[PDB]
Chains A and B, each alone.
Chain A
Amino acid sequence: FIETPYRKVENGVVTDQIDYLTADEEDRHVVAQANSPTDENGRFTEDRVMVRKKGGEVEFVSADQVDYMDVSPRQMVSVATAMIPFLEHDDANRALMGANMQRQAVPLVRSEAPLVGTGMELRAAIDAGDVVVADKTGVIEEVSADYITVMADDGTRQSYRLRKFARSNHGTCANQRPIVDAGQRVEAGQVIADGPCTQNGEMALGKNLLVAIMPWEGHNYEDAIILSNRLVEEDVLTSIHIEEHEIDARDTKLGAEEITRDIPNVSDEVLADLDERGIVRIGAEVRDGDILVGKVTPKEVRDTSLKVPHGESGKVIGIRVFSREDDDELPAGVNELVRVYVAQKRKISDGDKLAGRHGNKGVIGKILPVEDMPFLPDGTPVDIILNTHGVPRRMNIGQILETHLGWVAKAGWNIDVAAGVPDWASKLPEELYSAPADSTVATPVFDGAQEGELAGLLGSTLPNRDGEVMVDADGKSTLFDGRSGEPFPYPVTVGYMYILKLHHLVDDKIHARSTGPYSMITQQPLGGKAQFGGQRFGEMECWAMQAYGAAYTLQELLTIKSDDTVGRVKVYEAIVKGENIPEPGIPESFKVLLKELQSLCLNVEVLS
């Protein structure tokens, strides 16, 4: 049974004692809330404090009726949901979206951690394992890209090997990189290398981008969104994707499936990127159809080699061969296995999905040159334009607050306390009365930045290099049309937003077919993209195709495309020859049923 901790109240004064209760026990008491106030070593300030009860029956009750209390807020949330800032400002379905999209975020080449974030991004990386941490205190003896070597105080020398460009189970990259310098007195548990989506030891799944909340010239319509070409020049939202292809030289009883270079008669030009053994050469680049490993199954000899699939390319990273001349291990009837890895650097592109931690998602409709992007009086062109119309009906304004705080953090702040601390800062933790540029903050999900602490904290906003304040106390700037040249006549909301690139890419979704292989059971094309199949034309679609009164498209679709096996050939030939595409003189699915009803002694006469 699952247990969660609570704090023991004794008379109204919160004790520091813990109790890990389970649901049966919890249902017997009155469990309070973490935000409940306390004045002197625990006692509550109020008289009618809010609590739960047996059946989740939230109620206000006297603070003397209380028996337990929650240690923290964020108790009832998970990791991927305690990493969504301003969650109490976002409804639940879009928070669900945010989490389940923060899971499917592809690692980027160079990672960057959020300015505005949550306190639960350091642990989620330490307590996951893609970081490297020191087992023992000591100094650093050697630091290379692959190995790291530490000399501890006890004198024992440790050696950490790092994963470099290894393929995850989903195609992503798994490159680790050191963040330490020789002669560095590291402690125990100290991060020595960063992983695919960490920076200095905290989750960095996306990047901060300069965002303007505004509609543009139709290219951000219905949740679509716009980009600069900067994010493509500087390789900002770029990602490395690796693919694994395997081929086996297994027994056939007609000889031996041999892997060689003396392929049956083919262009020697295809046999140039192949090494002695007919396998492809590391560093070469490939393209659909290009040979990877020449495998000959005996007949005398045929050609069944491993060729690049449809819609794939890249550099050959490395190779992993497994032979039987070593007897390492291979399954029943095999003599050799070859695995070829190929890598592709993929840049953000028109169609690729993009999102934030708040359920704000969309595809990329337009990628603009920086010379036609809304820019600031200082010359800074924004990097992503998001529309206004999707925010209030989707109920995810946490991103507006995130934008504001991102500004407040990329541009520092100094609360002028000369005349005391303003009333909107009477609840602020000192050490938060000032900060430099490119600072990093934390807004825990249910104990974080408020709106008083964030309204007046937008005025401070240390000026730019020229003394000019580019954003006012409401969160807005004054932009310029990079096309016309005139300033948009109303101030626009600008800031910095943490944006995530997702596994839903268009190089993985674009599918098309004219001809190819069929199922030989139902005798239609196959269903799928790897199968190189077609698209389901269903019943509702046939209804919709009838209500137009379109009979020839329906005939075409139900005969010449899926089932009619003697018509698709006539069609291919007609088209390639440029003659009128024929027409079935008399329907064709009818003949077997005609036979078998005649065979049953029932006269049938196709009339005319």
Chain B
Amino acid sequence: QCGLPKLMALELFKPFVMKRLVDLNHAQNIKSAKRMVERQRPQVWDVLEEVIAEHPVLLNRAPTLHRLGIQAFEPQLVEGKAIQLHPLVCEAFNADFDGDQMAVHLPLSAEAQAEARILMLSSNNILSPASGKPLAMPRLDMVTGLYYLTTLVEGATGEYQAATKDAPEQGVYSSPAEAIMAMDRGALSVRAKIKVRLTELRPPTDLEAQLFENGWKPGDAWTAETTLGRVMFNELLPKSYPFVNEQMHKKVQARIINDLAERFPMIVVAQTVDKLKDAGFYWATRSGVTVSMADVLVPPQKQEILERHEAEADAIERKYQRGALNHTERNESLVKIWQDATEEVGKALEEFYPADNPIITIVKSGATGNLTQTRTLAGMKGLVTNPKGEFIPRPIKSSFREGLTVLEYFINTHGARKGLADTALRTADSGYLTRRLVDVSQDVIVREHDCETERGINVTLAERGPDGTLIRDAHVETSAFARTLATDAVDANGNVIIERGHDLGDPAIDALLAAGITTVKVRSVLTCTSATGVCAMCYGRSMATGKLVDIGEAVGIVAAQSIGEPGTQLTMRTFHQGGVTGGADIVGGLPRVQELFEARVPRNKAPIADVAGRVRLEESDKFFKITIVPDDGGEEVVYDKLSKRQRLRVITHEDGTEGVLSDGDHVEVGDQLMEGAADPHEVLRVQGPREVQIHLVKEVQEVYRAQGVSIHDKHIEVIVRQMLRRVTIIDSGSTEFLPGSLTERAEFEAENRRVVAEGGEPAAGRPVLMGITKASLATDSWLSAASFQETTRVLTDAAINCRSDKLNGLKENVIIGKLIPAGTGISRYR
């Protein structure tokens, strides 16, 4: 639902209003109806309810960095001139109500009406097509309401204390309605521990396997030791969903909605998030969360901390004046000191504050904010930046409660102005990378269900150690989750615990964790043996729907968006006009990512083992020599011109603190020998077209993880499959492939295997690793070619070869003015 004004719908829908006015004999013409609708007469207001019904409208807000920035809504006609927007669609849109505007588009053709009703409707896009996470989930007010409802307050009106045989129990209730009664009188708190008898609330499993042996049926009573708020919460979740009995921190609500989409339809999840909306709005008003200058408290150790640290900051300048220290190094020291102080203040401040405080409650509930802001407000602002971007070693010891002096305010303005441009240049960088990714991709549509292959990549699912239990890998919701299995999974015995073709998930992974497996072979697009694109079973399922992906689904654009959108959360190259190359230090954000996606040679390169075996290490002055001796073969290999600033590898096995690569060790093939990066071209000539893809995926995700960005690896898999899709030839074989020319690998196979007559020698070409830039120029159409330069070479080469345009990459169907061969515009569905 979306609220639409009566003067902003009248225009959009004007022709239909004319039609209706003329069928109901209000207007005898289309000219009189046009006039009537221009003069806004009293009769064009009834009509506009019979036509605005069941007709969706698309709402958009720019910049649009992903598809949820356009959503379909059912119009509800409202008096006013502003658009009413559900508060759960506002995190995708990135919208707020400080003035922000929004655009409205209207479809006309049945096909587009249905695409809106089905693909775009907000009650279907509950999840991100990038991690599977829900977006339309309770935000700040809802969160604090549900966190106050479900919390536990010792010493609350009506609690349970067992009464020590004076009266038996003193706090037990035969139902939730009796507890409501007791709450109205004032005899019970909604946050007090009680024992209730529940019949329409399915219990948990730990107790359901202990109080019911044939399946808990609604009406089968049980007893719950919990609060009334947790009850009323669970009374919003679906019927068969168990009892949670937990403080509804944001992560809990996320978890629960994830489980609900795993185990239920999506209409149910929509209804449920609306229920939670209503309830959190209710219990935020009645949560007592407000602001005063007495709800903003200051720890009394602050001054002791600051004196104890001024001692140090004085001893430093003392040494500086003694000559023991330079000025820049003195500033570095002081900044290291006034960083170990704001830390102690934040510590003492999250300690001193109670839990019933609103300023801490709104934070620890996940509704908004951080403890950094709470320290800045009630503690100390701390250090601030110059316009160079360096640190002023004189900190701001004052809070925005004490009030800042004139100098402190002035020097905060410096970095307060330097944040309005950054927030803009970062968008241009992100846009650059996103356009690159959308250029190489945009032709990775799903075309066939199953490639019918048994290839795949291995994924670790857990790791144990000196203990018994298995520690589950922290990279499961992006590597193995939402995949398809290639091999039936088996334990030591030999039976199948999870079978082929199974779409992994939370249940499946918890199972495989209960039986103790620590590796599983999974299908990916890095291996899908499909000519045009990828197969569903190799891609997997869609993170938005949670069901296996469909045929025709553009999965490259999704990848580009998912990777580019968070490009502003990443470090970048300094924005200063001129200076020294800051690459002297390490810079591993967007630079590393552009590097990898173009496949250029890393800066802090390190050599990799050409052959397994052992190592012999020698050191001259500033030069490292390394000689690998093979264990089985011979012809020891060597790397000599190895810089000594470049540090050796650090191994760090479980027990031994091996660390530095040593003389008398073992190096496998692919082992990086120096701390740094590897050249994907070396990794390729050593290992092949399946390991380099994995090194690239792993490095890109390393980057996007160190910055706190979660992306499912299959998007990187798409982007990398579109980087290793061609071969260079030196032998044509029986096949006629000009030796010295690049060609595809699927064409390679087709033309070099079908030859059973004349097949005296197959074709022969080796693979080439390229970057998305080149890889986007290697297209195989003469319309996307002419789209670029060099139209004449192309048109001639193609007219002499009497080629044909298959119209797949969809970059050319817009030129022609034709449907895109994706989703709803492919023959299967067209």
- A476 near B87: Cβ-Cβ < 8 Å: no
Residues of A contacting B58 in the complex (Cβ-Cβ under 8 angstroms): 553
- A397 near B11: Cβ-Cβ < 8 Å: no
Question: Chain B residues in contact with chain A, CB under 8 A?
Answer: 5, 7-16, 18-19, 22-23, 30, 38-39, 58, 60, 62-67, 69-70, 80-82, 87, 90, 95-99, 101, 103-105, 107-112, 115-116, 119-120, 129, 139-141, 144, 277, 281-282, 284-296, 358-359, 362, 367-370, 373-374, 376-377, 392, 394, 400-407, 409-413, 416-417, 419-420, 438, 442, 550, 552-554, 557-558, 560-561, 795, 799, 804, 810, 813-820, 822-825
Residues of A contacting B402 in the complex (Cβ-Cβ under 8 angstroms): 451
Could you say which of B11, B63, B561 contacts A512, with CB atoms under 8 Å apart? B11
Q: Name the residue in A88, A361, A583 with the highest tally of chain B Cβ atoms < 10 Å from its Cβ.
A: A88
- A389 near B141: Cβ-Cβ < 8 Å: yes
Residues of B contacting A557 in the complex (Cβ-Cβ under 8 angstroms): 105
Residues of B contacting A535 in the complex (Cβ-Cβ under 8 angstroms): 103, 105
Residues of B contacting A450 in the complex (Cβ-Cβ under 8 angstroms): 403
Residues of B contacting A507 in the complex (Cβ-Cβ under 8 angstroms): 81
Instruction: Map CB proximity to B onto A289-331 as digits: 1 under 8 Å, 0 otherwise.
Output: 1000000000000000000000100000000000000000000
Residues of A contacting B409 in the complex (Cβ-Cβ under 8 angstroms): 87-88, 92, 446
Residues of B contacting A311 in the complex (Cβ-Cβ under 8 angstroms): 7
CA distance A488 to B287 in the complex (A): 9
- B112 near A552: Cβ-Cβ < 8 Å: yes
Instruction: Map CB proximity to B onto A482-521 as digits: 1 under 8 Å, 0 otherwise.
Output: 0000001111110000000000101101101111000000
What are 5 A-B pairs with beta-carbon distances under 8 A? A92-B417, A474-B294, A489-B286, A545-B70, A547-B557
- B825 near A548: Cβ-Cβ < 8 Å: no
A-B pair number, CB within 8 angstroms: 335
Could you say which of A446, A493, A509, A510 contacts B7, with CB atoms under 8 Å apart? A510
- A556 near B112: Cβ-Cβ < 8 Å: yes
Residues of B contacting A96 in the complex (Cβ-Cβ under 8 angstroms): 416
- A552 near B405: Cβ-Cβ < 8 Å: no
Q: Name the residue in B14, B98, B139, B820 with the highest tally of chain A Cβ atoms < 10 Å from its Cβ.
A: B98
- A215 near B97: Cβ-Cβ < 8 Å: no
Sample of 14 further A-B pairs with CB below 8 A, known A70-B406, A547-B554, A549-B822: A33-B407, A91-B412, A213-B292, A218-B87, A400-B293, A543-B64, A548-B70, A549-B552, A552-B824, A555-B817, A558-B817, A572-B15, A587-B816, A587-B818
- A493 near B19: Cβ-Cβ < 8 Å: no
- A589 near B70: Cβ-Cβ < 8 Å: no
CA distance A155 to B820 in the complex (A): 88
**What is the CB-to-nearest-CB distance from A56 to chain B, in angstroms, rounded to a whole number?**
7
Q: Name the residue in A404, A540, A607 with the highest tally of chain B Cβ atoms < 10 Å from its Cβ.
A: A540
Instruction: Map CB proximity to B onto A445-481 as digits: 1 under 8 Å, 0 otherwise.
Output: 0100011001100000000000000000011100000
- A589 near B406: Cβ-Cβ < 8 Å: no
Could you say which of A92, A541, A546 contacts B412, with CB atoms under 8 Å apart? A92
Q: Taking A218-B87, A476-B290, A558-B817 as contacts, is the C-beta distance between A76 and B406 under 8 angstroms?
A: yes
- A510 near B5: Cβ-Cβ < 8 Å: yes
- A547 near B67: Cβ-Cβ < 8 Å: yes
**What is the CB-to-nearest-CB distance from A509 to chain B, in angstroms, rounded to a whole number?**
7
Residues of A contacting B405 in the complex (Cβ-Cβ under 8 angstroms): 33, 35, 50, 88, 446
CA distance A489 to B287 in the complex (A): 8
Residues of A contacting B376 in the complex (Cβ-Cβ under 8 angstroms): 395
Residues of B contacting A88 in the complex (Cβ-Cβ under 8 angstroms): 400, 403-405, 409
- A392 near B557: Cβ-Cβ < 8 Å: no
- A541 near B64: Cβ-Cβ < 8 Å: yes
Instruction: Map CB proximity to B onto A92-134 as digits: 1 under 8 Å, 0 otherwise.
Output: 1100100000000000000000000000000000000000000
Could you say which of B97, B392, B824 contacts A222, with CB atoms under 8 Å apart? B97
Q: Taking A217-B285, A549-B823, A588-B817 as contacts, is the C-beta distance between A59 and B400 under 8 angstroms?
A: no
Query: Top 4 nearest A-B pairs by Cβ distance?
Result: A549-B823, A490-B288, A351-B82, A551-B825
Residues of B contacting A571 in the complex (Cβ-Cβ under 8 angstroms): 108
- B814 near A577: Cβ-Cβ < 8 Å: no
CA distance A546 to B373 in the complex (A): 40
Residues of B contacting A353 in the complex (Cβ-Cβ under 8 angstroms): 99
Which residue of A is nearest B821, CB measured? A551
- A576 near B15: Cβ-Cβ < 8 Å: yes
- B119 near A451: Cβ-Cβ < 8 Å: no
Residues of A contacting B370 in the complex (Cβ-Cβ under 8 angstroms): 393
Could you say which of B282, B293, B560 contacts A454, with CB atoms under 8 Å apart? B293
- B39 near A289: Cβ-Cβ < 8 Å: yes
A363 within 8 A of B: yes
Could you say which of A504, A509, A514, A551 contacts B823, with CB atoms under 8 Å apart? A551
Which residue of A is nearest B3, CB measured? A350
**What is the CB-to-nearest-CB distance from B495 to chain A, in angstroms, rounded to a whole number?**
40
Residues of B contacting A208 in the complex (Cβ-Cβ under 8 angstroms): none
Residues of B contacting A578 in the complex (Cβ-Cβ under 8 angstroms): 19, 23
- A221 near B19: Cβ-Cβ < 8 Å: no
Interface residue total, chain A, C-beta cutoff 8 A: 117
CA distance A541 to B93 in the complex (A): 12
- B14 near A514: Cβ-Cβ < 8 Å: yes
Q: Taking A351-B80, A546-B810, A549-B553 as contacts, is the C-beta distance between A214 and B115 under 8 angstroms?
A: no
**What is the CB-to-nearest-CB distance from A212 to chain B, in angstroms, rounded to a whole number?**
8
Could you say which of A455, A488, A581 contacts B110, with CB atoms under 8 Å apart? A581
CA distance A226 to B419 in the complex (A): 31
State the main secondary structure of chain A at its contact with B.
loop
- B290 near A392: Cβ-Cβ < 8 Å: no
Residues of A contacting B10 in the complex (Cβ-Cβ under 8 angstroms): 512
CA distance A476 to B290 in the complex (A): 9
Interface residues of A in 528-564 (CB under 8 A from B): 535, 537-538, 540-541, 543-560
Question: Chain A residues in contact with chain B, CB under 8 A?
Answer: 33-35, 50, 52, 56, 58-59, 70, 73, 75-76, 86-93, 96, 213-218, 221-224, 288-289, 311, 349-351, 353, 361-363, 365, 387-389, 391-393, 395, 397, 400-401, 404, 446, 450-451, 454-455, 474-476, 488-493, 504, 506-507, 509-510, 512-515, 535, 537-538, 540-541, 543-560, 571-572, 575-578, 580-581, 583-584, 587-590, 597, 602-603, 607
Residues of B contacting A581 in the complex (Cβ-Cβ under 8 angstroms): 108-110
- A395 near B373: Cβ-Cβ < 8 Å: yes
CA distance A88 to B87 in the complex (A): 34
CA distance A451 to B112 in the complex (A): 61
Residues of B contacting A575 in the complex (Cβ-Cβ under 8 angstroms): 15-16, 19, 108
CA distance A475 to B104 in the complex (A): 44
- B38 near A289: Cβ-Cβ < 8 Å: yes
Q: Taking A552-B111, A581-B110 as contacts, is the C-beta distance between A489 and B288 under 8 angstroms?
A: yes
Which residue of B is nearest A475, CB measured? B292
- B817 near A590: Cβ-Cβ < 8 Å: yes
- B286 near A587: Cβ-Cβ < 8 Å: no
**What is the CB-to-nearest-CB distance from A209 to chain B, in angstroms, rounded to a whole number?**
17
- B817 near A363: Cβ-Cβ < 8 Å: no
CA distance A549 to B82 in the complex (A): 30
Could you say which of A70, A493, A590 contacts B291, with CB atoms under 8 Å apart? A493
CA distance A198 to B545 in the complex (A): 59
- B81 near A510: Cβ-Cβ < 8 Å: yes
Q: Taking A454-B293, A557-B105, A558-B817 as contacts, is the C-beta distance between A361 and B62 under 8 angstroms?
A: no
CA distance A559 to B815 in the complex (A): 11
- B824 near A216: Cβ-Cβ < 8 Å: no
CA distance A389 to B558 in the complex (A): 33
- B412 near A397: Cβ-Cβ < 8 Å: no
Q: Taking A50-B407, A89-B400, A543-B438 as contacts, is the C-beta distance between A350 and B80 under 8 angstroms?
A: yes
- B7 near A553: Cβ-Cβ < 8 Å: no
CA distance A575 to B109 in the complex (A): 10
**What is the CB-to-nearest-CB distance from A576 to chain B, in angstroms, rounded to a whole number?**
5
- A91 near B368: Cβ-Cβ < 8 Å: no
CA distance A349 to B344 in the complex (A): 48
- B285 near A538: Cβ-Cβ < 8 Å: no
Q: Taking A509-B101, A551-B825 as contacts, is the C-beta distance between A349 and B290 under 8 angstroms?
A: no
CA distance A33 to B406 in the complex (A): 8
- A551 near B820: Cβ-Cβ < 8 Å: yes
Q: Name the residue in A217, A393, A476, A560 with the highest tally of chain B Cβ atoms < 10 Å from its Cβ.
A: A393
